[PDB]
Structures are given as C-alpha cells and as structure tokens.
Nucleic acid binder design. Sequence first.
RNA 1: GCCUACCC
RNA 2: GGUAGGCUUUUCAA
Length: 520
Amino acid sequence: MDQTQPLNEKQVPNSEGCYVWQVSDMNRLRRFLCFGSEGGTYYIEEKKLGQENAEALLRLIEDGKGCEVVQEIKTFSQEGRAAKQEPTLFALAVCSQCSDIKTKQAAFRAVPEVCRIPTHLFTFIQFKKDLWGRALRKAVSDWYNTKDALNLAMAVTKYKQRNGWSHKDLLRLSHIKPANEGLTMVAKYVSKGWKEVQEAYSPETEKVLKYLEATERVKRTKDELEIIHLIDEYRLVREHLLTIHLKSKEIWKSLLQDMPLTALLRNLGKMTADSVLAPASSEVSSVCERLTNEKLLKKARIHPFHILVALETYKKGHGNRGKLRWIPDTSIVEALDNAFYKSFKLVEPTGKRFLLAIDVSASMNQRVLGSILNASVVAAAMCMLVARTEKDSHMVAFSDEMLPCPITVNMLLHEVVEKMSDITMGSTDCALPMLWAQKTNTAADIFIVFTDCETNVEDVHPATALKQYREKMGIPAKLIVCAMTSNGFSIADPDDRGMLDICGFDSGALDVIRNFTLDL
RNA sequence: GCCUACCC
RNA sequence: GGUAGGCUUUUCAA
Ligand SMILES: [Mg+2]
C-alpha cells in the first residue's frame, strides 16, 4: 500500500493520481483568502482553480456556514492576515448574493469594516457586477455618511477612481443623502466639481473646504515651493500631485516626511534612484527606523508577502516590469529583511521540538499571488519564521528524496531566496520527513510540512509515515500541513486529532501553530 | 501587458 | 485619443 492507492473511502486522487484527503471547506476558504487563484497552481489552471474555490464557498453557505464565512472574512481582513484583497472582497461579494438571507445581511453589514479604502469598495462593487438595490444602496451610503467630512475628503482625493469606478458613480447609483454639511460639500465636490462647490460656498466645515481647495491648488500652481508647503499643511500624498512633479527630488523629500508605509515600501526603489534616499543620509536612516517598527507595520497592515516582494525586487537594483535602476542600499535591505519577521503576529515560544520540512519539488516552482516568488521561497520564509521563534527546531528540504537543507537560521532573507533557486525541482514524496526523522532517530513533537500536498511517489502515505513514527519513537508527534496553494488537497488525516491543516502565509499562522502545539 | 494622474 | 509618472498589481495617513 502506497500513495498510488487510497487509505480509505474518504480520500480522493490528486492532480497526479495519488491519494490524499480533501481539505475541509472552511480551511480551503483560508487557503483561498491567502493565495487566491491567479496563475492557478502547477497542476490546476487559473480558471478551474477559481471554480473549485467558488464551489467550496457555495457549499459552505448551502450547509449553513454562511455567517461563519463572513465572520472569518471579516477577521482575516481586519487583522490583515492576507497579502491581497481580491479573494476576501470576492468572497464578501458572493456572500452578498447567496441564497441565505442571514449571510447576505451579514455581508453588507461587514462592508465598512472590510472596505477601509475606496479601492476595496470599488473592487467589491465590481465583483457584484461580474456576479442597484436596498442592501447595496444602503451599504454604499453608510460607507460615506458614517465617515468624517475631512476624512472622506482625503479618501476621495487620494483615490479619485479605481478599476473603472469613481465616487461619482457610487454616489449617484446609491442616491445617498449627505448626513451633514461637511458631507454635502464633499459630495458636491465629487459629482459637480470644485467650481460648482466653490461657487456654492462652521469651523469644522471650513476645514473641509480648505482642504479641498488645497487639493485643487497643488494641481494649478507651477511653484514647487507652494506644493511642498501645501503637502506640509494638509498631509497631501503622492496621488495628490501631478505626475510631472514626481521627478523632483525635493517633492519626495517632502513626500517621504510622513509617507504612509505601503507607499514608502513600494517606492523604495524609486527614491534610491532619485538620490532622495542617498547612502548615509538621514532620510535613509529614517526609513529603516520606520520599516522595522512592528507597531506601525501592524497599524499600516503591512503583510509579510509585500515585504518579501519588495525585498526581492529592491536588492535586484532594478524592477521586473518597471524600467528604472538603483544601487540597492544595504541599510534598507537589512531593514526590510528584518521587517519581514515583525509583520507576522509574533508569539511566545513553546519550547517544543519542531521538525520543519520544506517541499522543494518541481511543482513548488509554481508562482504565488501572481508574483515573482514561488511556493518554494515562500515556504522557506515561513520556515525561517517558525525556526527563529522556536529555537529547538531542525529544518529540512525534500522532493522525492531528502536533500541537504540549503538554508540556515542565521541567513538573511534574500540569501534564502536564491538558495531555494538552485534547489527547487524533482517529484514529491511527502512522507520523507517523518520517515527521515524515524531513521535518524530524530525526536520531534511537531512536524510542519510546507507543501501543496501533491505527493506522487510510490512510498507509504505520509499519514502512515507519521503513525509509524509515533510507534517507533514513542512520541505523540503531531503533524501540521502548511498549505502553499488554494487547491483542495491535504495529506492530513481528518480522523487523527494530531494532524492539523493550516494555510501558508497567514500572518496569523504563528498563533494557530502555537494553539495546536499546546493542545488548544 | 497593466496601474494612475493631467490635457483633450 | 494626446501627455506624464510608475508597475514592488494597484500604493490600507490608521
Ligand atoms: Mg512537487
């Protein structure tokens, strides 16, 4: 009996013909929220991946899980555990339509806590289209009227329109009625324009006009000094400036001052190139100190993935799609690579013995989140995270055989990246870890395997490998399968309480692994 | 092959 | 359509 055969009825065949279990729908929801379905997986095409995921979603609703889904969606977004928003917003959209009315009413109810910025809403509304009314009109209206005039003003000027949707269309389609003078002004500004509003017009309301005026002013003035001035006075950001100003060193030195974190993160390369982040500079020193402030990273909801993508591209001196070059600053590379570990919800060590196994087979070459990072690299990063928290941990890599582990606990993130480079390839034997462990008489209480569960060699089933391990070593060893995709497969036996299914790249992954290690 | 802003 | 920034995919002051 090997992986080519089913252990029991419950099991189903992979994408390779070998047998595994089907991840619980709830768990697949999490996989989906974190990885989405762009580019699909190594075996499943993008389109069918989304279809497989859409099916599981509806299945949950069918089964009553309607409100648990929204609650989970609501929680992942607020806690910022998912790199990108599309999957969450698409999920909240499907729920916003499902048969259940409990779920639907819960979906629109959570819209303002999930759609924090215009883009989020625009993407939500567009999804509803790919799939107005009382609920919709109400939800959109509440999004604006519950805000503070002065805040809405920034929101609507920072994000005038995204993906084909403007606040002008939303305001009109929802037939909103400004809850106060401040909001009517902003609304009039949006639908009718500055002139109309300027022509039509409290201390609080004046503040709102002032601002709107500022935003209009920084687009007519030729004087750079005045631009810089307004930026200082009204905290105007990049989106507020005419793109011709974005070539001025002094504009950015003024823009960097209190630049939001994602903005700062996505423009590290450009600022270095324009000498705004010159070597040894105060500015650079400032940047590093901000990127490594866990609280602000947390406040700005900087996901570790975004850090990884920026680090990879930043040290490359040049972009992937971009077309500018810069001498990568070593202080920044050390600050980003440091920030990576602070972006995850950190936890107190348990002290247990962990065996961390990275699936490095050919399939792990598959690209994640439509980025330039592959599952191999991401799995290794997640691995480094768990290894720097629980010191008693031995890392190992595998494909269809045990391979010398290319990385170490003391390596900087970009060294672990290129090392996974030279080694990703081969077939998949997901039982090797447990098997290796027994053979080297290596003790462990927890096994964490970072895989896509597409095991395919004629060797015993990983679940079988774990049992043989328990019996042989006399340890109740548990097994945590950290998923690297949104496929619906798992080498984890649902009937074994010592086997858990978690998602890779959930900034909250650390807490789940802990709760499980500690029998919670 | 894509995102924005400005003019038209 | 013309022009200009950027692509670390859409820039979460939070
Ligand atoms: Mg493989």
